[PDB]
């Protein structure tokens, strides 16, 4: 038995890792299907299981020596991907937790540390005209970037007035290049409602941001990519209609 060697099998997907930290269970609470006492919709939901509950590789950013960090908004990342997104479009109501496996590996002569974090209801603010006298709002491509994700305007402030200096409150996991090469976060369905639109509302936001900068000598590898992988758990859909998008 060991702590750093792990394997994650969901549906027909499988992730292996030999240099990891222990798995974080979000808020000390495993993802679950919705009870008959929490639910309110009378429709009999679809629980497609294997077809949608599986790992998805959606993006791969290049961690350069001077990067501000990126973020993704869930579950807008999958809405056009796979047979999960198909159910999320034909339906009004959706419910699921995720199994995020951020991954980034380098040599032993590289250094740097990422900060993987899952911040629920990550509302994004705008630079108010530089001076503070403009009630502007972010475009659709900033609040719902989707596949490619979005680069932070400023990383210190989390583009919302809140400090990254205390982001390790909500479920997080560091990727420190000298110890681990991947992070794994399991979150349950975090919402005040038993179901939600999945298109309009975004349950949380994945914040992949470096705090200690990537550095390396004149070695033989300057291209160090971070890759994002996720997998819906206990997925439920209700309120069937026509295919609707963004």
């Amino acid at each position: 038995y060991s702590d750093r060697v792990a394997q994650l099998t969901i549906g027909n997907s499988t992730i292996t890792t030999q240099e990891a930290a222990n798995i974080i269970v979000g808020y000390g609470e495993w993802p679950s299907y919705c009870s008959d006492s929490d639910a309110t919709a009378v429709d009999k939901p679809t629980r497609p299981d294997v077809s949608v509950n599986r790992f998805y590789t959606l993006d791969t950013k290049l961690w350069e020596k001077s990067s501000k960090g990126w973020y993704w908004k869930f579950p807008d990342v999958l809405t056009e991907t796979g047979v999960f997104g198909q159910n999320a479009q034909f339906h009004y109501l959706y419910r699921s937790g995720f199994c995020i496996h951020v991954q980034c590996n380098a040599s032993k002569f590289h250094q740097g540390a990422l900060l993987v974090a899952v911040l629920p209801e990550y509302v994004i603010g705008t630079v108010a005209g530089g001076t503070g006298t403009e009630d502007s709002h972010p475009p659709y491509k900033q609040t719902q970037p989707g596949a490619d994700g979005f680069e932070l305007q400023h990383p210190y402030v989390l583009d919302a007035g809140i400090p990254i200096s205390q982001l390790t409150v909500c479920p997080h996991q560091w990727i420190n290049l000298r110890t681990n090469n991947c992070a794994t976060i399991i979150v349950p369905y975090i919402n005040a409602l038993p179901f939600d639109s999945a298109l309009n509302h975004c349950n949380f936001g994945l914040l992949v941001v470096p705090i200690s900068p990537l550095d390396y000598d004149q070695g033989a590898t300057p291209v160090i990519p971070i890759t994002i992988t996720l997998a819906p758990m206990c997925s439920e859909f209700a309120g069937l209609r026509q295919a609707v998008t963004q």
Binding site: Y1, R4, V5, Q7, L8, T9, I10, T14, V50, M233
Partner: protein
């Protein structure tokens, strides 16, 4: 004390071969149990080390969520008996009226299974094999015509007198087996026991059969184990006057009660000679087909 301890304890002379593995029954293909998702640290089936020398122990139930499958596919077709009980061509004996080949209605054939690639390669999969045999003899003319001739096949075991004539005195067959067939009759068929002095036939003898110096002269006898050299095969006309028809005899071998032992890689180059794994050096071919790029189909 008495006697010495390093003799009392000593495992010298231990007879039984210590078995690291026993055989289990597998009438049907393995069934598949149901599987669910698993997100744990420490339990990791997919990761393995090929360096060890073992095959992947990772089962499909731990690589993908699987359903239940009651597999009842039989494994009988894939057994040594049901794989080798297929009669194949192992010899062609020619008896022309007048040619370069045997012209007196008596041919001698030192019994060599090889010399015919299809039956050879199938057999060459294993190094040691032990089996009884069922030989069939098909006789006809070079056109395939059936003619009223009377042949005599004779089995000449090692050391027995070989026929030097169409009407040799050896054709009395007072002891060694011989068969009298007409071409009008259906193919003659005979069952043959395992008659090697060794526990098994060898398709490979990595050595010389004789002692002393092995100069460039006696270098062709390398790979010659007399244990699977079971003698010669002889055909008659029969005498005494020469035949009236051109004849062809084809020998077919069927194996039964087969027991092969150690497995061998499978030939990928053209066979060139009998009892000799030589190959064309400038015409070395890949084991299979090839494509233009590894990123295309």
């Amino acid at each position: 004390g008495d006697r010495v301890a390093d003799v009392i304890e000593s495992s010298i002379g231990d007879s039984v071969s210590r078995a690291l593995t026993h055989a289990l029954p597998a009438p049907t293909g393995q069934n598949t149990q149901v599987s669910s998702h698993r997100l744990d640290t420490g339990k990791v089936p997919a990761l393995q080390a090929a360096e060890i020398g073992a095959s992947s122990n990772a089962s499909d139930e731990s690589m993908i969520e699987t359903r239940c499958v009651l597999n009842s596919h039989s494994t009988a077709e894939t057994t040594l008996d049901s794989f080798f009980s297929r009669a194949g061509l192992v010899g062609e004996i020619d008896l022309p009226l007048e040619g370069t080949t045997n012209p007196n209605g008596y041919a001698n054939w030192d019994i060599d299974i090889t010399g015919y690639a299809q039956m050879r390669r199938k057999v060459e999969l294993f190094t040691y094999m032990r089996f009884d045999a069922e030989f069939t003899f098909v006789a006809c003319t070079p056109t395939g015509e059936v003619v009223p001739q009377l042949l005599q096949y004779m089995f000449v075991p090692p050391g027995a007198p070989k026929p030097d004539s169409r009407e040799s005195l050896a054709w009395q067959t007072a002891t060694n087996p011989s068969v009298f067939v007409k071409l009008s009759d259906p193919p003659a068929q005979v069952s043959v026991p395992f008659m090697s002095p060794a526990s098994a036939y060898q398709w490979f003898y990595d050595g010389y059969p004789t002692f002393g110096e092995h100069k460039q002269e006696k270098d062709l006898e390398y790979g010659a184990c007399p244990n699977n050299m079971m003698g010669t095969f002889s055909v008659r006309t029969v005498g005494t006057s020469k035949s009236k028809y051109p004849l062809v005899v084809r020998i077919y071998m069927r194996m039964k009660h087969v027991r092969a032992w150690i497995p061998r890689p499978m030939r990928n180059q053209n066979y060139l000679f009998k009892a000799n794994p030589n190959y064309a050096g400038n015409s070395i071919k890949p084991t299979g087909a090839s494509r233009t790029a590894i990123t295309t189909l």
